[PDB]
Design goal:
binds 2'-deoxyuridine 5'-alpha,beta-imido-triphosphate; Palm domain of DNA polymerase; DNA-binding; alpha+beta; Nucleotidyltransferase, domain 5; binds calcium ion; 6 domains; transferase/dna; RB69; DNA Polymerase, Chain A, domain 1
DNA sequence: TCGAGTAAGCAGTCCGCG
DNA sequence: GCGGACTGCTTAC
């Protein structure tokens, strides 16, 4: 086994490293690492070190890390560049692990924990830690055990021991339904007092010191609470035992309007699962409570209890502890599905960074590029201060709002990374500039050729063609990695569709799911056996295929995120390689590429249709074009098709065999025009959309930029068992839209696209008639709530107070004098409802914490005074009116001459 | 919302528009 | 009543 690091820290002149040694054992060492930095030197040297621009450098070896840091300072005092990796632990890792790191996750201690704190006087602030910690559940991945630390005696009540036998029992037996698969993995430890609980927890921690530390809100709540509580009871030295190097720092986390405190534990890598989820899930949720996210991800039921959480330990300690254990398990279940810890480990070891730095693509890419350059004895430039400046982005075509019956979309492969590679865009490949023509002139190929020597972008930048830049080289590596995982994702998706088809005809038999790899397209043999399976086995297979698809999605979309973020880092002032010339070279080239191929596709289709100046491309955004295929379908005639799948096959074949070759030809000419290094503009068919054959469905519609809906039959080679709605930007897709209204609007759209106007009209009439019966949470709007205090003038709305903030102020007055009532937290999300005139709350709306039932204090009154008429008009009718007017149809039947019959 | 980027939509406030 | 100027928020890419 090759060695690999677990954690690394700088503490003064020492590097403290935890690592796995060649024998698979965890070790710790302190190293008096002597860093090197670099200065430019005269050309007449015998040096082996050169900067990225090929200027010679001399290496300066320092007695210690403080000397190196002091030197950087003095070089600024003198006004000269201090080159090299200034984050010395990254240089340490580069020197100590000078090879592609192979890590073994079974040796990495991943701890998942959650604490309970009974509090009678509101939220227990971690900075005060004034209340006893009365439960800790700590799961250790190496032991595969849930360690439960239970406080039986507290100022807030003495309780009996938790019973594992009651915990395992069904809720219908009066039990807690702790999952059978973890029952034997629980190690239960009750305590007579909190001091003993905390002392044993620290002994346990010393024995099983986390490398990766996670859980839900652990960084913002559990870790600072535990640290500060131990600090209050025992003193600082004892609290610092949470760090394997006994070093901690209170860290101030700042944002635009306020700040908060977290505890940095040296030698631990904290990856709070809420933050992994927010960065890597590609969702925007109405609530980030663990209950809400667990229900969403796992389809598990909310953990039910009577009374407020502040009284749960005293009234039902049995359930209190069982729910603490279940909470820890739910995070493990979410990670089994989403695999964000696996992702973070992969990325972190790839880049050779502290694992917690995966949250920062700037840090990640700084390390990747440094390591790549170091291999060639090249020296990275010093980071510099830059003022924040706006720069231009992508092109989005203004669509004509309309219905669109048959639509084929086409999409460029990882566009911005492909532009970087094609043009060869990198800090050290800048060759110079040329005189720019208006963009229109390049799009129409009328402008003079930018260069006969260098590779160009239409922003005026020129790049060397003799060798790949470090940015192209390194982005290519991660791009290639993504390609593999996207393959697994799509195979799993196609395999899912095979199971969905078979589920129409399930055999009557007692059966087992097939032992297969869902990452690869099912063989003919597997397909034959599937057609003979029971519904029970097929559903299990479908669940497994969909889990495989999620696994692939995580791996691929987040490698996409990483490479897109290298582009974005080029336009962030804190990146070592920040350069607006390069960031703009990418975006301006993208604008040209899309509009150039719009022209080429229009020309090609006008030719094949023997027509003049017809606009076949109806829409485009960044890297995609949407093509009207009505005329292609009409040239065959609808009556000639056997079924929907027949015309879908026809369009699929037309796109692959006819359009893609012409698109390729168009892009190769563009490459020659810009004299690029390598042709990498690969635009493939994405979606095939249209109404079911013989129906009155409209197929699709656009209301404006970034707002459209399509009935899709085939997406990137996946032929759906049932057509799938692709809806972008519309209210069905927004977390701010009420849950029941997303559902209703989606059905309105389904009916529009698949069935037609009459079907839409019958559904609307029914929804309007019944909507007042819907649960208040399902019809509440959602919003983030920032700057509550800014708009709070003596408890009332100040000038220009936002609607949702107004609601929060209404809520705050209504719960005034209640320390127990849930508080709205600055920066979190709220549910919002409008209120009828003359209500007792004194205003037109009310808001309360999202993911929660409104407190019983005011629930009855909110329900009584909820303005259903305003709710319906604003969240449902207005957007529907938008969809229908765009699609040129009516959601209500207009009067006709037949009416008098 | 500590953590790569820009484009661009809609809700709502304020207030003009004879 | 609707638009523009503006803030706030959320989406597409
Ligand atoms: O989060 C994003 C998304 C997109 N983009 C830019 C870069 C990207 O290459 C371009 C196109 O984005 P898409 O999301 O359409 N996907 P891309 O072409 O990168 O990859 P894929 O092959 O999946 O579409 O828009 C970002 O900068 N950040
Ligand atoms: Ca809890
Ligand atoms: Ca793409
Ligand atoms: Ca594609
Ligand atoms: Ca069958
Ligand atoms: Ca795309
Ligand atoms: Ca192709």
């Amino acid at each position: 086994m090759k060695e690999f690091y677990l954690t690394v820290e700088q503490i003064g002149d020492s590097i403290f490293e935890r690592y796995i040694d060649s024998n698979g054992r965890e070790r710790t060492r302190e190293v008096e690492y002597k860093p090197s930095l670099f200065a430019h030197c005269p050309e007449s040297q015998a040096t082996k070190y050169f900067d990225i621009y090929g200027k010679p450098c001399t290496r300066k070896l320092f007695a210690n890390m403080r000397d190196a840091s002091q030197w950087i300072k003095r070089m600024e005092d003198i006004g000269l560049e201090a080159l090299g990796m200034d984050d010395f632990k990254l240089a340490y890792l580069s020197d100590t692990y000078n090879y592609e790191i192979k890590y073994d996750h079974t040796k990495i201690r991943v701890a998942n924990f959650d604490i309970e704190v009974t509090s009678p006087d509101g939220f227990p602030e971690p900075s005060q830690a004034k209340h006893p910690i009365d439960a800790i559940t700590h799961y250790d991945s190496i032991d595969d055990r849930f360690y439960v630390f239970d406080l039986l005696n507290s100022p807030y009540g003495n309780v009996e021991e938790w019973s594992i036998e009651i915990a395992a029992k069904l809720q219908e037996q009066g039990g807690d339904e702790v999952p059978s698969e973890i029952i034997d993995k629980i190690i239960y430890m009750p305590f007579d007092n909190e001091k003993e609980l905390l002392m044993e927890y620290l002994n346990f921690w010393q024995q099983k010191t986390p490398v990766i530390l996670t859980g839900w809100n652990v960084e913002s709540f559990d870790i600072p609470y535990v640290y500060n509580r131990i600090k209050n009871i025992f003193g600082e030295s004892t609290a610092k035992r949470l760090s394997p190097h006994r070093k901690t720092r209170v860290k101030v986390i700042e944002n635009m309007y306020g700040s908060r405190e977290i505890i940095t534990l040296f030698g631990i890598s904290v990856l709070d699962y809420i933050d992994l989820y927010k960065k890597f899930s590609f969702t925007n949720q109405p609530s980030y409570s663990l209950d809400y996210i667990s229900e969403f991800e796992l389809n598990v039921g909310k953990l039910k209890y009577d009374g407020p959480i502040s009284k749960l330990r005293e009234s039902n300690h049995q359930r209190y502890i069982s729910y603490n254990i279940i909470d820890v398990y739910r995070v493990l279940q979410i990670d089994a599905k989403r695999q964000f810890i696996n992702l973070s480990l992969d990325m972190g070891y790839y880049a050779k960074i502290q694992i917690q730095s995966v949250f920062s693509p700037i840090k990640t890419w700084d390390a990747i590029i440094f390591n790549s350059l170091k291999e060639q004895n090249k020296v990275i430039p010093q980071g510099r201060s830059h003022p924040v400046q706006p720069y231009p982005g992508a092109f989005v075509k203004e669509p004509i709002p309309n219905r669109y019956k048959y639509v084929m979309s086409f999409d460029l492969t990882s566009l911005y990374p492909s532009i970087i590679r094609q043009v060869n865009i990198s800090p050290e490949t800048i060759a110079g500039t040329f005189k720019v023509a208006p963009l229109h002139d390049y799009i129409n190929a009328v402008a003079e050729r930018p260069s006969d020597v260098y590779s160009c972008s239409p922003n005026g930048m020129m790049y060397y063609k003799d060798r790949d830049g470090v940015v192209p080289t390194e982005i290519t590596k991660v791009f290639n990695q993504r390609k593999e995982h996207k393959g697994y994702m799509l195979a799993a998706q196609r395999n899912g569709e095979i199971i969905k088809e078979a589920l129409h005809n399930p055999n009557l038999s007692v059966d087992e799911p097939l032992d297969v790899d869902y990452r690869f397209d099912f063989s003919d043999e597997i397909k034959e056996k599937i057609k003979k399976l029971s519904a029970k086995s097929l559903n299990e297979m479908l669940f497994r295929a969909q889990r495989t698809e999620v696994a692939g999605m995580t791996a691929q979309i987040n490698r996409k995120l990483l490479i897109n973020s290298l582009y974005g880092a080029l336009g962030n002032v804190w990146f070592r390689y920040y350069d607006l010339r390069n960031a703009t070279a990418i975006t301006t080239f993208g604008q040209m590429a899309l509009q150039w191929i719009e022209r080429k596709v229009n020309e090609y289709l006008n030719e094949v249709c023997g027509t003049e100046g017809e606009a076949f491309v109806l829409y485009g955004d960044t890297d995609s074009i949407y093509v009207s295929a009505d005329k292609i379908i009409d040239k065959v005639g609808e009556s000639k098709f056997r079924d929907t799948n027949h015309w879908v096959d026809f369009l699929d074949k037309f796109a692959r065999e006819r359009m893609e070759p012409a698109i390729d030809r168009g892009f190769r000419e563009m490459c020659e025009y810009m004299n690029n290094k390598q042709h990498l503009m690969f635009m493939d068919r994405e979606a095939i959309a249209g109404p079911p054959l013989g129906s009155k469905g409209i197929g699709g519609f656009w209301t404006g930029k970034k707002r459209y809906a399509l009935n899709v039959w085939d997406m990137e080679g996946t032929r759906y068992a049932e057509p799938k709605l692709k809806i972008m930007g519309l209210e069905t897709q927004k977390s701010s839209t009420p849950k029941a209204v997303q559902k209703a609007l989606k059905e309105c759209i389904r009916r529009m696209l698949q069935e037609g106007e009459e079907s839409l009209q019958e559904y609307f009439k029914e929804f309007e008639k019944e909507f007042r019966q819907l649960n208040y949470i399902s019809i509440a709007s959602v919003s983030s709530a920032n700057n509550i205090a800014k708009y709070d003038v003596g408890g009332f709305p100040g000038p220009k107070c936002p609607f949702h903030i107004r609601g929060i102020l209404t809520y705050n007055r209504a719960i005034k004098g209640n320390i127990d009532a849930p508080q709205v937290v600055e920066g979190e999300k709220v549910y919002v409802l409008p209120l009828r005139e003359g209500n007792p709350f004194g205003d037109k709306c009310i808001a309360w914490p999202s993911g929660t039932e409104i407190t019983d204090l005011i629930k009855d009154d909110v329900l009584h005074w909820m303005d259903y008429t305003v709710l319906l008009e604003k969240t449902f009718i207005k957007p529907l009116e938008g969809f229908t007017s765009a699609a040129k149809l009516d959601y209500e039947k207009k009067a006709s001459l037949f009416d008098m019959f």
